[model samples]
Target chain A: KRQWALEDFEIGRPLGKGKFGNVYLAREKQSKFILALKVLFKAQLEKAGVEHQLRREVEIQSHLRHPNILRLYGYFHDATRVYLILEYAPLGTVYRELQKLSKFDEQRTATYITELANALSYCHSKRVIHRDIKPENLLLGSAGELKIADFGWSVHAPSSRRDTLCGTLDYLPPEMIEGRMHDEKVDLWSLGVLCYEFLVGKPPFEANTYQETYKRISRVEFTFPDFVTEGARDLISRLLKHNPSQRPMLREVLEHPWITANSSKP
Target chain B: RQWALEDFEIGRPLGKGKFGNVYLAREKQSKFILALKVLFKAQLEKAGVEHQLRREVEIQSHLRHPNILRLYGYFHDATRVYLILEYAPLGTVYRELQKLSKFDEQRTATYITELANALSYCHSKRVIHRDIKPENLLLGSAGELKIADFGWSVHAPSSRRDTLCGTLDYLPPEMIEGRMHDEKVDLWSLGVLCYEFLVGKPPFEANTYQETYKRISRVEFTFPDFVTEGARDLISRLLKHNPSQRPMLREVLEHPWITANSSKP
Candidate 1:
């Protein structure tokens, strides 16, 4: 009854390149809707045995509707490529911004943390775990709003927990590093890492090598920079707890003095 | 979209209602058992309330929860509209409660918790299930509660609904006073249902319908001596005059009575 094709869009320049293929800026000819057309080669996806993973990503992202989340409008596949029609964030990836500016000030960090906390709370409530949460996965909207742009490693697990390790090395939660079953708490831990990264220039558990990073994560070792405030320190340390349940809840994090005092909308 | 009444080999009449009768029918193609809610088009058209039926179908069909009864699919023909519903073999809670006058605290709390969860789900999706009496409740397998019969439900996404609808004895003070009501109307009905489950009658139930309405408007109701303090406290909290003052469904679920006495599904 419905379909999508390449000819329907006024194809623009390549936004960037990735493992599978590349994303392009485009407009739907029918509605003139400006969207990020993410095109993945079917051959590449099939060769990597990640076709099912791409399907899962599409399924998960399409259902979630939140202000801080980058919207997945729909998807269409040609014979050789699959295109994900996605919400276009004008300010590009947060990773690029972080690289250009080195690090964020307290107010900006608090605001980003507040938005991420709210968005992650929404995800957890819906029984979906965004296993991979990092600077690379975030985008900035024209309004300076933080949009969660990637859902490649997200899963919709209704059960309490799942035994899966599918996230970045430095951003991995303690449970995942230790090979225990993980739940939504993994997102909480990653948020802590992201918060630290925002305040500082790098992730908390990053090390000289993979084994050392794993050790650091398992030990829950991290050092805040001298500029970090007491409240920010407290929030990050609480979220980075070794035991997932010991971490302060998302609401508590939002209500923390660090967040409320510095955040634009607390 | 292709479902029709002819697809089912209707077995026997399960019950009768205002517009139609339900049957324990099996879809001949899938060998799947379902409740065929056959509503005569002429009767609904005469009542001039097919929009209510359409709204019920839309709202109930979107909900996905363990305690809410499933409306699998629906179809219509020239003379009749048929609803493909999940058949609750254990039948209505009205039948059981009527057969055995009252329920103890455990089953009562269990049913209350399940309904709270279901109503909370409905409210999350902006659905106000205006009807919550024993007749609208069904028993699934293993004595699980399934909220059925959403004929009075409304999906109020962003508006304050003021429809003076629902049954007499269960009407809250707001509806009785002709004031606009929201999800809290269901909360009030839940309080009434809990009381009925325990005392074999509604708390504000009186001789005449007007007297019942009077009692409901005044928020005048007394608990039985047998009711526990926790149960009484919860019902009291729910049956408040101000809709905003009513404890949220989560608070109801966390209430001491439900937590202590409720049997986990």
Candidate 2:
């Protein structure tokens, strides 16, 4: 059929809502494919001038069919709304999970980091750079597996470089902060920050204000909490390097002593 | 550690390829039913497309679309490479189409719409399925179309490709003229596919390859009397002499003929 109307789905409780739309837990009436139906208002999208941004997001996410990446099944639109059929992450957002636990143990953190590293590695091989890699963008599957759930800021870096000023301030790499061209290494830097957050309950470069946060990120200034293990501390230091060239590759991160030593059956 | 050959229980042969055959196998651990495409390394080395096979796996493995076949993973032995793929229990569109001779407007429109969605997703990723035909399209148990066979595909991010690949009947004018083309080539093939679906044969099906090429270059094709006007109009729009004039995939999906039944209760 050309369009998937609101009736084709048996909508349940509201999953979430954003500035432009609301996400609902839905099941396709025929196929019974349970999905997250993201209803975006065309009026709001046009008002925000992010219609092109939404198109780019759909373009990038639809082609990426990885177990660790959230799947975009397909999309249809009507006069006022655009509906995106997305894979349902039953366990919900990883950010919410992290909030409950405060901080994860080394083994759990190691397993999640490994999965993120592998997923990011796959993205890099396809020349797709996920500029934002934070807990908020991560979702947990029913089996407690991690999936990269957002790609609004991602781009296909065919030449392995981009100069867009994107991503959250706390996770921005030094190259992005300096307005220099950055590549997939920016993800690695964010990966380090995420790992730190996983273990320490906060990102590495957090400060009193946005200006101080930017300054700390630019200078690569961060102190490891006393609770972090030596192995994680060492890996985080290498990953949070100011020079992108000096930061460890994702493969190296996957094989790092912290990841390998604390890794459990996932 | 690498995945070993002993991890799977190989079953009956599904289909045969140039170098080897595809088999229906089940993974021992997960008991997942998958199609194991076993390619002979010797034949690959002889044909000098070992790099091509690797590229196919690299491209297909990363692509995840409902209408696109899934490449689960791959493992290699001493003299062969085994690619684990999602098994479409209903077999290929070619076999089914041959049995039925021709499909009604609804079935043809549904399949064409699904193919358009899959191809649009691929093009958005800068990947092109150079070979798109009934033979390469498979059907799931629920009769969903899955685009398969990426052996002739290319992942061109921004630049146009000039390689001459794909079947003769499905070739576009640009590919025949040895000109550079982008994702538009797939649209031309889709037009041919839609025609093939409605009628029992491709739009340009001559006895010889030369005649077929001549017809394709001239955009020569006559619709049967039974073909619906909407279907014929969409086909003509897709099979334009100039690639740029062809309708975009989004437009094809929005076409009245394809969406006519969609609005019905």
Candidate 3:
């Protein structure tokens, strides 16, 4: 009775470019529902070898039901490419807002953290690890609720962990950069990176060189700016630990006093 | 001999209400377990709520649905009136909500779908429930939702009603604005109940009554960080400032939010 297809949509302007695809604004003709149709060329996925169990995570991501995670409504494939019908986020990417702001205040930053942390807690419970968690991969909804917008860079191993590097250099935890096995803790570390960036408008371990950044990240090198609160400093420090085992669970991060003090709901 | 207090055996007290308290009762001769809601006629007369009692019996006695609490019959003695209702063993949805604080999306969707089906049936029969909150809802033995307490319902078959009814937090804009409202008010209440189910409080709830009224007129509210986007969409579509903009109960049943998280396969 139900199936999604190309002709069902009234496609509009493209949102922006991504690694393997571009998301286009579209509308379902009959239901008049809006969607962000992400089009990815299968050949590019092959050429870049980005398929790294991506096909598997698509279904897992599609079903990870939560408020802060964007819904992958459905997906389809053709000869040259595949298309994902995604919830249309009216407010655009979180990175755009971060770049324009001086730095998000603790209330807003903590709200965002609580939302993302809550979502990742559910994600990890399902045994699906979102290897990538950054501002660029987040989106704002009409209500200003933050949502995890990308599932392309994720892992769905069985109770186990991933041994390869799977995310951006700056957000990478010590284990990720050293080619050591990683788990949901990598997401915790990235959240720490994101927390610092949200408050200071830049990642804590930023360096002039990629190698230099790696060294800093391996050493868990970072500092709080003058305006950052001690409560926030504690939250950031808790997540940015060099040892993955030392990082707090996303649930713990959600209950951290910094989040409790700043967020309306914890 | 046909039906009397002597024919029914009253058991433990179930709960209390505005004008009455219900009991776990049995039709002794028929061996049928039911709920006997007892109210004093003097209390009803003093409270000036006999019209609601009469109307409730008039409307609920004939309605038939799995989700609507069945009012099988009524009996009156010299000073008391009693209503025989279907026994819902699990008691009020409100009690369970109090214990859990809030419900997960699946349970919320399940109850929402049940209400949609039940409410759709009522609308088709020209009945509208002006009050639909957790306290007025009961859970059967199987945890299935059942709508109860039809004292605030109106069996309107003609002009749009202008009565300012329903709980303050659950009342729609039309009632607050003093405009004519139709069955769409139920849509708004269902939306409020859905929000209450997921967020543990009504969306338009405020610290003051005047502020609550202001919120009702303006339809002011915000979703917490944890309410799902699908849920937010459904709640948004249903809580329209203009009642006509809200989706019909039929459409609500088909909403992706309902279909995805519902009890059915």
Best-fitting candidate, scored by TM-score: 3
DockQ of prediction 2: 0.01
Each candidate's root-mean-square deviation in Å?
19.9, 24.3, 20.0
All models: lDDT?
Answer: 0.84, 0.84, 0.84
Cα shift from native, residue B192, model 2 (Å): 40
- Over A135-157, each residue of candidate 2 has an lDDT whose tens digit, in order, gives 88898887888899768778766
For candidate 2, chain B by itself scores a TM value of 0.94
Give the docking tier of candidate 2: incorrect
Report the number of clashing residue pairs per model: 0, 0, 0
State how far residue B164 of model 3 sits from its true place (Å). Answer: 32
Worst 10 residues of 1 chain B by lDDT: B157-166
Clashes of 3: 0
What's the best-to-worst order under TM-score? 3, 1, 2
